[PDB]
Amino acid sequence: QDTFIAAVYEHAAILPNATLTPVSREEALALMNRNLDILEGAITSAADQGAHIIVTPEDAIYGWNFNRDSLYPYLEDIPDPEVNWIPCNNRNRFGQTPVQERLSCLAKNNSIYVVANIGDKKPCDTSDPQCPPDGRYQYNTDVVFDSQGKLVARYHKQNLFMGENQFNVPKEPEIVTFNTTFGSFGIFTCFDILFHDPAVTLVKDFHVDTIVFPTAWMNVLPHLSAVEFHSAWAMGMRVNFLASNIHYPSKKMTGSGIYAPNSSRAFHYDMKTEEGKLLLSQLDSHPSHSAVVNWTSYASSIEALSSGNKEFKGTVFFDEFTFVKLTGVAGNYTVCQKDLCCHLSYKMSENIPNEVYALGAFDGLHTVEGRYYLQICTLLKCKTTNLNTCGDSAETASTRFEMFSLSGTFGTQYVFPEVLLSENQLAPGEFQVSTDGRLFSLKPTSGPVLTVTLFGRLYEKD
Ligand SMILES: O=C(c1cnc(N2CC[C@H](O)C2)s1)N1CCC2(CCOCC2)C1
């Protein structure tokens, strides 16, 4: 089959009541079942609309407020899928696996692939030199059940985010895939998307067509809003992408979507309500990739579009960019820092007076809640008119752009093209990437621009 119905669910999760000591296994199962009822409502809706696969969010079933012991009652010992097990049909094969059983049955009775995130526990002995002192590993685990309810993939999150002290890290990164009549799929979780393993190995070495992506992502503007960066990543890596995000505006958790190599196909962003949302979209089983892009070709082919600028430092996500302020309603600007030069050409729909935009270049190591080397070229709307706010989270803008064109002398080929509009809206089909590394507008933007960014990762320099 050449196309398939993809679904993602944004889940307003029921969080376990605050308790000082760990709950019983029955209370744990009761809370997880409260979440699975809602998730099943989504799965049934997707099946009734003919979906082939549905992704649900990270931590969607038991939440994220845990220490090791208070999490333990929620864990199940999840076997390796090579055991060839359908929990729905052979319950009791392995013992105390009710959550796996219910996920299996949801996948089977609704004839739909189900991707869910749950907790794995793996007992270990002192025989094991890295057994944790409390006698077991606990892993943040994606499980996939096929349309028959078979366990076809289990993935332990490699790159733990801060505040995940309830979990352990696998001894080695797990490259987990599963094959289907509608393509080869790879899986990783939330923070993983910012690192090489497994996320980049899946695409570059195992050539998967589609990533399934449970996430509990807290938006960090201007470059790391969920929809913005996930769709940008799918575009740069050239895969389909099913991002299923928690809904929790209080913590800036919102943004779910279905993304394709050529464009975003569906997306959701909602800070106002507490409702979940099911998204569906058609995808090609095996997409085309246009010619690969040399991200520094064009940028290395110009001389600076501007010289003797008034440059200044301004802070984006604790990273200090070198900025030049955009003064004219249209202009050609170049900005450099260390090894990275960023070129912008732009014509705004109008000069909104109390709105300031800037072009910034960053080339260095990020260290706050994550260590990773970055090369970023960004056109962005400054939070206020104060140049000290250029880089701060900005959610709204009024300046639309008639045209833009951004490029950079990137020292990496992993560069993810981002375009975000006011109110955190994607711009599907309004822009393109050329083979020589320009991200440019195909027409005037449909809404005011928050950012146009080329976000590049230099994994070797971590
Ligand atoms: O995977 C994640 C990420 C959430 N936001 C992330 N990023 C990436 C870029 C920027 O740093 C923002 S990663 N998890 C799982 C555990 C979690 C712990 C925090 O509280 C609740 C949920 C958060």
Neighbours of 372 (CB within 10 A): 16
* Ligand 1 midpoint to CA 216 (Å): 6
Give the span between the Cα atoms of 427 and 416, in whole angstroms. Answer: 15
Q: Is the distance from CB of 254 to CB of 270 less than 8 angstroms?
A: yes
CATH topology of domain 3-284: Nitrilase/N-carbamoyl-D-aminoacid amidohydrolase (3.60.110)
Q: What are the structure tokens assigned to 356, written together?
A: 């300031």
- The residue written with tokens 């560069």 in the block is 415
Q: Exposed (0-12), middle (13-18) or buried (19+): which is 358, by Cβ within 10 Å?
A: buried
106 phi-psi bin (left φ>0, alpha ψ -120 to 50, beta other): alpha
The alpha carbon of 325 and the centre of ligand 1 are apart by a number of angstroms equal to 32
d(CA 216, CA 229): 14
Residue ranges lining ligand 1, Cβ < 6 Å: 58, 64, 161, 163-164, 190-191, 216-218, 220, 224, 369-370
From 11, 165, 195, 218, the mutation candidate for ligand 1 (largest count of ligand atoms within 8 A of CB) is: 218
Q: What are the respective helix, strand and coil percentages of the chain, to the nearest 5?
A: 20, 35, 45
Measured between alpha carbons, how far is residue 434 from residues 293, 362, 442 in Å?
Answer: 7, 22, 11
Resolution (A): 2.3
Closest CA to 331 of 351, 355, 313, 302: 351
Candidate from 58, 61, 156, 161 with most ligand 1 atoms within 8 A of CB, to mutate: 161
Residue 10: strand pairing partners: 277
Give the residue, by CA position, lying nearest to ligand 1 atom 9: 224
Please report the atom of ligand 1 found closest to the CA of residue 369. 11
Distance between Cα 208 and ligand 1 center (Å): 25
Experimental method: X-ray
Domain extent listing, the chain? 3-284, 297-461
Structure tokens at 372: 């990773």
Ligand 1: residue of 217, 227, 229 to mutate (most ligand atoms within 8 A of CB) is 217
Dist CA 39 CA 35 (whole Å): 6
Catalytic residues: 58, 157, 190
- Rounded to an integer, what distance in angstroms lies between the CA atom of residue 102 and that of residue 7? 19
Atom 22 in ligand 1: residue holding the nearest Cα? 216
* 65 to 27, 28, 106: CA distances (angstroms): 16, 13, 26
* Planar angle of CA 68, 72, 75, nearest 5 degrees: 125
Decide the pairing of beta strands 372-381 and 439-441.
unpaired
